[PDB]
Amino acid sequence: MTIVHRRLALAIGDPHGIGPEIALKALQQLSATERSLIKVYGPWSALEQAAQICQMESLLQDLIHEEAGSLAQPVQCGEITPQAGLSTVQSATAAIRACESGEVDAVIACPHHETAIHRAGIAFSGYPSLLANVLGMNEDEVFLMLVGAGLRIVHVTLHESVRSALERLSPQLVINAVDAAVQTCTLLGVPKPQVAVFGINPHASEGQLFGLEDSQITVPAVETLRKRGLTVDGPMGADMVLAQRKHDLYVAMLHDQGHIPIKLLAPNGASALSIGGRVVLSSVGHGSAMDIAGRGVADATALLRTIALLGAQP
Amino acid sequence: MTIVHRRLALAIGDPHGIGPEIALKALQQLSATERSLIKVYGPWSALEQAAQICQMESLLQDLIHEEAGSLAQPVQCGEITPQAGLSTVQSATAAIRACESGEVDAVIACPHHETAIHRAGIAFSGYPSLLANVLGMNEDEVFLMLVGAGLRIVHVTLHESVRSALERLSPQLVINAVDAAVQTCTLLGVPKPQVAVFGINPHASEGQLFGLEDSQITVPAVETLRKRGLTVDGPMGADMVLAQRKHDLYVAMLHDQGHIPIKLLAPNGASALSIGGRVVLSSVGHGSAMDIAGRGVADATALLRTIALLGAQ
Amino acid sequence: TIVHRRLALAIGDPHGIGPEIALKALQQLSATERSLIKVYGPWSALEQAAQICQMESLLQDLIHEEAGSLAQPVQCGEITPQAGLSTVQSATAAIRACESGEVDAVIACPHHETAIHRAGIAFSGYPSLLANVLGMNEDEVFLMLVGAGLRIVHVTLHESVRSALERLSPQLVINAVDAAVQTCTLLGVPKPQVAVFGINPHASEGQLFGLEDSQITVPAVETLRKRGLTVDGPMGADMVLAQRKHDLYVAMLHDQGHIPIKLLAPGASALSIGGRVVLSSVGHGSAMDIAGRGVADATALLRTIALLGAQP
Amino acid sequence: TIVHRRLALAIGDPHGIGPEIALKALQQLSATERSLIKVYGPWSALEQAAQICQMESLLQDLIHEEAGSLAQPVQCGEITPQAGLSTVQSATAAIRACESGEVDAVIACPHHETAIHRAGIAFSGYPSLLANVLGMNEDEVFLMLVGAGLRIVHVTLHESVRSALERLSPQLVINAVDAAVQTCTLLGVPKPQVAVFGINPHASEGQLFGLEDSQITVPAVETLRKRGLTVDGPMGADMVLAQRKHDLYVAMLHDQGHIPIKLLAPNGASALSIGGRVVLSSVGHGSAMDIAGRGVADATALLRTIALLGAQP
Ligand SMILES: O=C(O)c1ccc(O)cc1O
Ligand SMILES: O=C(O)c1ccc(O)cc1O
Ligand SMILES: [Cl-]
Ligand SMILES: [Zn+2]
Ligand SMILES: [Zn+2]
Ligand SMILES: [Zn+2]
Ligand SMILES: [Zn+2]
């Protein structure tokens, strides 16, 4: 029945795509108490436009809203414009800032459009980067946790070469990833998670038979984490520990380790959470669907599920 | 409750887009009796794929299906491929042929993707063209009737320049449009419709103060239609006769005459019917939404409304 | 307060409902508002109307200029050449007062075509009458319909589609927009968002459905933007109207503009725009059958006053 | 040294001369002074301006907050809805920074009314904009002109004389004085000697030339003295200005205040919009689109505005 148990910022994404409309449909389906926990970031004009089209004007009065990504002309649904690109980023930036300040506890971004953003002259390569930039952090102090099919997997490294990732790995980097992911687990409604750390090398180096990295990196880090009072197994061969399927959070050393399981088991319904400082940002997992914008064919299921995920009860 | 009272062919459109998905969601909402009146044309594989995503396997057994637009390799949701273009057209072609043969009474096409069809090497300019080709007809024996907000408007011309349209207009062309649209009215559940013919010129030439075209074209055509026993008023200024809102079918000379009223009053309740021989094909009036395809977020409302429209006695 | 500039009100056919509705509309305004509206017509018709409606004391507070004086008593309902001449004389004096700058716009109460024709006067609409009075070509006067929030100016009107197409030029489109933009200021939208309709369906769709748009509407839009106007198009009229997000639409052809307006509004106001003069009709007939029983509705007049009287 | 407090500088229309004069003014200050002025506007406009004015070295040590970001490159001299939005976004961020206490006053560089109108934003002056932003009634925000030693706050502005007279109340005069007295502190006159103008000639001369003064200015003066303020009047505006012994005059009507200021300072007046704790001043010249890009605009009026709002005590 009730899926929102905390304060959330909802950025409406590209004001020309389906974001505004699915934002309205999602809020519609919530109770009044739930609506008052969701603060919406975007141009009012886009939500007004969307509301006209969907015949949901009565909903706009009950909306907590902060203007962001104001446009200089009316909304043109379905058009890829530099303006809507700037809007998108301005909206997500204001949502993120509200999370950073403590006004909300997590962020959801509705679908952007990469081309719209590029044509505005703005570099954008994903939510992990955007979040890093906005919070004044290096991109490797923001981590991606994939969630799907009961698996939660945080990545100690991400979009770089295997060699570069290996060169970056340190006991402290693993610890930062776990800390950030454990906090995120609390949000997702698992206060005391059972954690498994993947091995850098096959079979977690098998002692030191298949490299020194694990004895230098994952083994010390696990020890420090146990000492701080966490329930951590490993390191263990990723293949082996995932198979057991008895942990609430897995810690993957490399992109592929985490991404393969998630995409294989949850190919149509996974959430990608960017975690940095106190900020948890998730997307909706789908594009802006320009050709159906304002055409009343998009439903809010994926958004609602994302809300359910970040909005779970302690 | 129930909206399907006749036999319908449902072509699932681009097997990579949202067509399969919305096909399943629409059929879900119907009773078993209603499901058995909709025969589905498309690759089984795409419906299987869609069923996985929506968790609606239980529905596939109760589905009247004819394989069409088979794919030789798996469904890849969200990709624009020549293969999915050919599939689209093959499915719609099989649905159309089923209507032509009398196996069904009308066709609904789920959303195509123009680029997918173009990349297959197939010329495509709309359902009117496709229907013409398939039924062995010239393009100006197939007419577009828009439906929404109580308005039904058939177009004597469509998708050409005003000049070109005027050069084409003849008493006979107007007659063919009305005939086709009158038959279609029976399908839509209005046996004996009251017809209003738009004037070519403002105020239907206004006693020929504003051109001779109406006296050459619309006036003779109206006469012939009355003589054949039809209830036809006009020609009349389109602006004037639409305002009265007391006709079951309007006959527009030019695209804009028909399209403006429909889209102004119903910008997302518009059905576009291609009418040729005994075949009525309606689209769903939205794209294939590649960005959400296989993401389980697609609404079947527009399809359901199309079904309600073609489905009444 | 609905009257925020000076208006000339021509009472139209002195035998129809015009005088009567002129009085009833002024009645409903404050005294301040009454003094902004100067009335053009035969005093005798206003006196007649006032007697019937029992509104004599309102005639004293009226700014009036005699025009279209009658030679005999008022005969309500009756079509006479005299009432035809009166009509035209009244509207001519209202127009001239606008042209001179004495008022800021004109409202004409309902005429009667037959009355005017029987007087020997050629008359084909307010566009014509305005053109002839101001010494202009009839193709420099444009009609803008206003109703249900829609404002639509017509680049052509009241000729065959073929004839209209033969006339259309980049310059003619530009004149229509200019005239309509100025008019928008009066209506209380100084800097409007403009949509230009395509000549051909889908505005020719590049050049796939004719060359007209690439030759006519496309250059004209590119002059208008350059001069600093907020103009979208050309676009398929059907598409752009549907969105209902522009303050002024520019129609190439009568039907394009007239269908939307008449479908959404049972009334509409029709503004004839020429030079600096905006003349609006009251959008209904002279209603000869109900003239002078003191039962006539001034609502349409009041709405026309509200429209042309709007705040900057 | 002319900057003795923290100031927000909104760079106005990013397409006009605002960014350019912003740079030239900051150039003329010491480094210490520069660090007291926080600049609000699109970085891209400042980058453009820096190229033109050959002041790249100034950009790195500049206190800047991005505001009114553009979605496309800067086009000097062009009136665009985008630059209109930028203007207002920048001024809104400067105002918000003053409201929060981050700065002590705001200077707005020249806007362009047409650019703002074309963006769909209602704009009738800085008084309006400030009212909207601060969640205040538009008639709780007052304009004070400053020039040639005259400071004059206006109880009304920018409406018909009749309309102004209909609005005047004891309370409105009181609000004007209060707002202006606070502003006086900023300008470096903590405890000013105030003169209230009469509505009517000779302040009505008792009641001989109208009742308004006895009903409006006389009670208001009484209440202000009672609250502990040093206030003379009401007196004929012509008479009290002549005495030239007050630190602040209170005008009932636009022309009462505007005539003296513009006669004595026809080129060098500052217009301060005063609302809540926010003081916003314009630069009192336009955006000069004709010369934007050409690096030939004088920053004197800006520097003078800075000197005024940046004053010592
Ligand atoms: O590889 C991906 O699918 C991917 C996409 C987006 C993102 O933030 C992180 C990812 O690993
Ligand atoms: O009328 C003016 O001179 C004027 C100009 C700018 C401003 O902000 C306020 C004003 O009264
Ligand atoms: Cl037409
Ligand atoms: Zn990746
Ligand atoms: Zn079309
Ligand atoms: Zn007409
Ligand atoms: Zn002024």
Tab-separated table of C-alpha atoms in Angstrom, chain C residues 190-191 193 225 227-230, chain D residues 79 81 113-114 117-120:
chain	number	residue	atom	x	y	z
C	190	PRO	CA	2.385	43.137	-26.282
C	191	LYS	CA	4.932	40.424	-27.132
C	193	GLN	CA	4.051	33.894	-29.271
C	225	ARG	CA	12.362	36.236	-36.528
C	227	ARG	CA	13.046	41.570	-36.978
C	228	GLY	CA	12.809	40.096	-33.475
C	229	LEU	CA	9.425	38.354	-33.259
C	230	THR	CA	8.783	35.025	-31.478
D	79	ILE	CA	17.756	40.247	-28.072
D	81	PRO	CA	14.295	35.142	-24.686
D	113	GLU	CA	12.849	44.698	-21.165
D	114	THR	CA	12.104	43.145	-24.555
D	117	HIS	CA	9.096	40.005	-22.092
D	118	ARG	CA	9.949	37.632	-24.927
D	119	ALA	CA	10.833	35.005	-22.288
D	120	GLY	CA	7.233	35.166	-20.990
